[model samples]
Target: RACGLIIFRRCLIPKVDNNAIEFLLLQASDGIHHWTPPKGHVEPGEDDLETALRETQEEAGIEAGQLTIIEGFKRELNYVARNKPKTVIYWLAEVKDYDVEIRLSHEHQAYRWLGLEEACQLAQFKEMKAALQEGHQFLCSIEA
Candidate 1:
């Protein structure tokens, strides 16, 4: 099992290719080169939220100090990965700095900051697509 956040940032620049809201996605180093948000296995004695925070920091270099966790937006997905049942949990979070710098880890080969639709299309998983849609909706609900 793994846990992380669907982290997004507000782009101050005009919408050129991507929209105002850009979600962070990382392409894995191997195995079909799948794209996903930062996530990893849980450490012993660590709760789900803590695992999410830790994974986000280690995988994408986004620390808890850099994000505001959006309340009431937790998602879970289950599937068979590498011949084992895998469960992934996610929470919605926003980058505190709209122009935050991302430092990638060795686990990923590339990264993209995309709008909801584009991110969902790149994610390529039914559950992840729905998760992005839900996360977008949550943002819309709290729109100022």
Candidate 2:
């Protein structure tokens, strides 16, 4: 099993900024150069949320306390990879600071903060794009 966090932040730039309201995505060094949020296989004896937090820091240098985790709307993705079934759970999180530099590990070749449309276009996968859209809608509802 794997766990991850969808870390997002409100649009800090001007309303006309094309790339406001960014979602974080990291390009994997392996596996078709697929882009995903920070995630990793769960460690033995660690809880799912713990694994999520650890992987976020390991993959993107973000710690647990650096963001405010939103309640509800947890999702699990099940898919086949290398002939093995994998499950990944994700939760939405809002970063308290917008200007924090994201440090990537060797697992990722590059990182980007993209708006919803650009994120969906680059994400490619239907389910992943849906997750991003749902998370964004959830944030908007709560913000209002």
Candidate 3:
């Protein structure tokens, strides 16, 4: 019942660090302060996409309308947490405002805009890394 967005923005000046695209990731306030894309559990009466939108706003201060959702790209990952199975769905979204400043919630300690390789390294989990890898491929294909 959780959802999020793999939010990114096009780099006006391509860099080796970003490979021309920058991704947004948040460092959690809890746990080991692990990094992840903005996401949270779905509230009652909320659909997955709605949950994604709300969570993005809650965690990053980015409104839903401020992003362009890249249709036809969504992924779900499942794993056990705290003795229970948890699932998260993520969608590809492009932030319309390159100058947009992210205001993080208390749930997160910090936020960073990172390149694919750096992001993958910080993600740690194989699935998280793969999501970013596969996402970069898909993004390139679509942008091409």
Candidate 4:
């Protein structure tokens, strides 16, 4: 099992700006070239949330201090990968800075900041799409 945060930012821009929320997606360098948020296998002596933040920083270059993580809305997904059962838990986070550059590690080849529909389309998995939608809705309801 593994855990991570799907960090997004509400960008206030012109032209295509209408509460456009962008979710961070990273393309893996190996295995099917699948795209997902920053995550990794849990390490010894680390808690889930700590692992989440650490992997987010190591994989996406987004440090823990730069994100405002929402509490009490964690989602867990379990599926088969490489014929082995794998589980990943995710919590929603709101990035404080919209323009932060994502620096990828060897695990990822590319990164994208995409809107809701685009993110869901790119993700392709039902559970992933549901998680993205739930995170988006949670942010929308609390936006001030």
lDDT of each candidate versus the true structure:
0.88, 0.84, 0.87, 0.87
lDDT of residue 35 for candidate 4: 86
In model 1, the runs with Cα more than 4 Å from the true position are: 12-18
TM-score of each: 0.92, 0.91, 0.92, 0.92
Better of 1 and 3 by TM-score: 3
- Model 2 CA deviation exceeding 4 Å by range: none
Task: Compose the digit string of candidate 3's lDDT tens values, residues 40-116.
Answer: 99988999999898899999999977988999889898876678998999998999988887989889989889889
Candidate 4 C-alpha error for residue 115, in Å: 0.6
- Pairs clashing in candidate 3? none
lDDT of 2: 0.84
Model 1, 132: alpha-carbon shift in Å?
A: 0.7
Which residue pairs in candidate 4 collide? none
Candidate 1 lDDT over 43-138, as tens digits, reads 999999999999999999888889999998999988877789989999999999976777788889888989888899999989989988988888
Q: What is the lDDT of residue 91 in candidate 1?
A: 95
